[PDB]
Amino acid sequence: TKSFTLPILTISEMTNSRFPIPIEQLYTAPNETNVVQCQNGRCTLDGELQGTTQLLSSAICSYRGRTLANNDSWDQNLLQLSYPNGASYDPTDEVPAPLGTQDFSGILYGVLTQDNVTEGTGEAKNAKGIYISTTSGKFTPKIGSIGLHSITGDVHHNQQSRFTPVGIAVNENTPFKQWVLPHYSGSLALNTNLAPAVAPTFPGEQLLFFRSRVPCVQGLHGQDAFIDCLLPQEWVNHFYQEAAPSQTDVALIRFVNPDTGRTLFEAKLHRSGFITVSHTGNYPLVIPPNGHFRFDSWVNQFYSLAPM
Amino acid sequence: TKSFTLPILTISEMTNSRFPIPIEQLYTAPNETNVVQCQNGRCTLDGELQGTTQLLSSAICSYRGRTLANNDSWDQNLLQLSYPNGASYDPTDEVPAPLGTQDFSGILYGVLTQDNVTEGTGEAKNAKGIYISTTSGKFTPKIGSIGLHSITGDVHHNQQSRFTPVGIAVNENTPFKQWVLPHYSGSLALNTNLAPAVAPTFPGEQLLFFRSRVPCVQGLHGQDAFIDCLLPQEWVNHFYQEAAPSQTDVALIRFVNPDTGRTLFEAKLHRSGFITVSHTGNYPLVIPPNGHFRFDSWVNQFYSLAPM
């Protein structure tokens, strides 16, 4: 039996598994009416990837394929999605959508690049600012196509194109809802192959999130936009490499000062890949920059954590 | 002795350590006039980071800090830098520049985001297209600031801002030179704290690179823009985590087809963190997509690799 371990990384040495940006904060909050069912950053403790989760942060909310002109005021072009090797996407794969597809509802903003242009064409002429909205009828990544709304630049028809994500956007009628899953097939079919929803079951416990501030290119004045993941990408990749068998349903872990080994707080790491702590209320944790989690032992799902 | 290991990954499961994009190819070539002294993706086999190397691919070529207006027709603003993890940048730190700073000469293109704006301000109005040129006299990241040439959008003064890299650009007088190090202090001072230059010393050997195509938003019509790194970011992170003692100066590795067990080629993984192979000339490797590297043993200085 290979022993279960965690990476020794500090929180600032880890990446959000739902958007390609660094983790900034540990944050615990109740679920209130949210269904916490994100599809990126989902991995069991014994290394089984779930949902739309893959290994590369540079593939999260990234798309590539061939552009196709579309007669619509919002989506002036569609993107026929292709695998990184170039082959067309296969909707029969047992996944909710292409791996790395955005798992939040609202507008994703980024830059499309296409066939290289001559130097004389002008500055950044092969860069197009794009809104990818999940509330558009053309957002059907499971079927292999998404809608591109151009803001800056001219998107050319029938060119191999790559989309690099930058942030999210909120306009007058499209709020950013990080816990509302997109309809990966639009209205044509229901979502499939989803990683399960997660929630604390033991009274007094709340989920502990790895929190990042995602750039917001429109809306949300005077407030930070947040994307919260259940596992950092480095933990997903570690469990995938190690594939250590899970001895019980819950691994007790301790957040420690690495110099002294002293425990700052303890938490429950559940076998399906999420963390709970004993706290009541919204809470951004105050922790030393050198602290990190350490696997302690395997316990039961109703172990009584020390309050933090 | 703790045993040295490699992560089990195909090359499409690897990230370029000099730009946040996946690896696409393996490539070997002679050094001819290039001084190979990149500063990102530098790590010894026993886990010692060098140059400007840090652990997050999402921090490579990313910048953050506060903008300030600048009376210049090219650099209309400067970015007063932090470290990419937000920690105050101290120019007396023993680093060439803030970790993750671009290590190629030319123009880096990306998107700047600033204080969030109201919805009514307009679509993507908190997104600014930016050229960051290393040939500008304002590219002095070691001193604590870089110049921002805005193409689209209005860069606001004295706002906490983030720069997300998208690709490179080539205008009429700024070629993309991936092996010409920037002057991190400009003309005021020479580069400091550099990871050493690398070159093959054994007869018949050449460096082996992990190669990606970087998007180019201006210029290089009909040509591909390549960024070559000495180690994938996943190997940097793995060596940092494991810190396995190096038993000799050279680790013999092999690239295998896991189905047939065939060694497609063997290579020297040097203690200072780079790979050499036995080949003469420019050669993009032809390899099956399921191939991966394996560690064989520690060898001496005069091991003769099988030609590939």
User: Where do the structural domains in chain B lie, given as residue ranges?
Assistant: 1-59+170-308, 60-169
Contact check, Cβ <8 Å, A127/B120: no
Interface mutation target, options A99, A109, A126, A131, chain B, most CBs of B under 10 Å:
A126
> b/e per residue, A147-160, with b = 16+ CB within 10 A?
bbbbbbbebbeeee
Q: How large is the C-alpha radius of gyration of chain A?
A: 21
Distance CA A289, CA A291 (A): 6
CA distance A9 to chain B (A): 8
Give the residue among B291, B261, B302 at the shortest CA–CA distance from B26: B291
What does the angle CA B197 – CA B202 – CA B207 come to, to the nearest 5 degrees? 50
CA distance A203 to chain B (A): 35
CA distance B53 to chain A (A): 12
Amino acid at residue number B112 = L
Under DSSP, the state recorded for A256 is E
The runs of H, that is alpha helices, within B174-253 are 233-242
CA distance B19 to chain A (A): 10
Using left for φ > 0, alpha for ψ between -120 and 50, and beta otherwise, residue B159 falls in beta
Under DSSP, the state recorded for A149 is E
Beta strands in chain A (DSSP E): 25-29, 63-69, 77-81, 107-113, 128-133, 145-152, 160-169, 205-214, 225-229, 250-256, 263-270, 274-278, 283-284, 292-299
List of residues 6+ apart from A87 with CB closer than 8 A: none
Contact check, Cβ <8 Å, B116/A14: no
Which of A119, A164, A167 lies closest to B166 in CB terms?
Answer: A164
Contact check, Cβ <8 Å, A171/B123: yes
- Residues forming beta bridges with residue B105, ordered by sequence position: B177
Residue of A nearest to B153 (CA): A152
- B90, with CB counted inside 10 A (0-12, 13-18, 19+), is exposed
Nearest 5°: phi and psi at B59?
Answer: -110, -5
Chain B CB contacts of A172 below 8 Å: 119-120
Give the residue among A190, A62, A83 at the shortest CA–CA distance from A144: A83
Distance CA B43, CA B274 (A): 9
CA distance B281 to chain A (A): 26
Residue of B nearest to A108 (CA): B124
At B68, list the tokens: 């300030």
Distance CA A117, CA B159 (A): 33
The structure was resolved to a resolution in Å of 1.7
Distance CA A29, CA A275 (A): 12
Spell out the long-range contacts of B199-203 with Cβ–Cβ below 8 A and sequence spacing 24 or more: B199/B31, B199/B36, B200/B31, B200/B276, B202/B268, B202/B276, B202/B302, B202/B305
The upper half-sphere exposure of residue B54, i.e. CA atoms within 13 Å in the direction of its Cβ, equals 26
* 3-state secondary structure at position A228: strand
Contact check, Cβ <8 Å, B217/A125: yes
Q: Does 3.40.50.300 match the CATH number of domain A1-59+170-308?
A: no
CA distance A279 to chain B (A): 27
Distance CA B268, CA B275 (A): 5
The CA dihedral of B186, B190, B196, B200, to the nearest 10 degrees, is: 80
Q: Cβ distance B230 to B14 under 8 Å? A: no
The size of the A-B interface in CB pairs under 8 A is 170
Which DSSP helix (H) or strand (E) runs through B27? strand B25-29
Q: Which CATH number fits domain A60-169: 3.90.550.10, 3.40.309.10, 3.30.465.10, 2.40.30.120?
A: 2.40.30.120
Q: Cβ distance A266 to A252 under 8 Å? A: yes
Interface mutation target, options B53, B54, B60, B85, chain A, most CBs of A under 10 Å:
B85
Contact check, Cβ <8 Å, A56/B22: yes
Under DSSP, the state recorded for A50 is -
Distance CA A18, CA A41 (A): 6
Residue of A nearest to B10 (CA): A55
What method was applied to determine this entry? X-ray
Contact check, Cβ <8 Å, A20/B20: yes
Amino acid at residue number A82 = S
Chain B CB contacts of A242 below 8 Å: none
Contact check, Cβ <8 Å, A123/B222: no
Under DSSP, the state recorded for A184 is T
Contact check, Cβ <8 Å, B123/A116: no
Contact check, Cβ <8 Å, A218/B8: no
